[PDB]
Amino acid sequence: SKLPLLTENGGRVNRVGFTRIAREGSIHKFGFFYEFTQESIDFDSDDGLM
Amino acid sequence: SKLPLLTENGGRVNRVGFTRIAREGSIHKFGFFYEFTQESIDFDSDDGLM
């Protein structure tokens, strides 16, 4: 019932349209840290602690 | 009962005929279109829309 049929006289028949879509995404921020003292390094048994 | 049996006298017996059929096909017309304006091209963000 929706086939674009055409007669020998043509005319303004079977017009169509188009569409488009948009996608999006965003970034975020992360981080963490730790703290220490000089003694916690110098007097510790393991010299490879850091 | 319908075998073409023939005797020694021959004669006009067991005549047959033939037939033929006609097939047909035809073509049809199709088409469609779309329209646009100059502003839909010049002011649109996407220079590759067309």
- CB-CB: which of B30, B34, B35 is closest to A6? B30
Task: Reduce the DSSP state of residue A13 to 3 states and report it.
Answer: coil
- Which technique? cryo-EM
Look up residue B40 and give its two tokens: 């839909």
From B31, B29, B30, B49, select the one nearest B39 (Cα to Cα): B49
Cβ-based contacts of B47 with chain A (< 8 Å): none
Please give the single-letter amino acid code of residue A22.
A
Q: Residue A6 CB: number of other CB atoms within 10 A?
A: 15
Distance (Å) from the alpha carbon of B43 to chain A's nearest alpha carbon:
16
If you write DSSP's letter for every residue of B1-50 in order, what string do you get? Answer: -------TT--S-----------------B--B----SHHHHSSS-TT--
From A38, A6, A39, select the one nearest B32 (Cα to Cα): A6
Distance (Å) from the alpha carbon of A3 to chain B's nearest alpha carbon:
8
Tell me the β-bridge partners of B30: A5
From B12, B4, B19, B29, select the one nearest A5 (Cα to Cα): B29
From A36, A45, A18, A29, select the one nearest B32 (Cα to Cα): A18
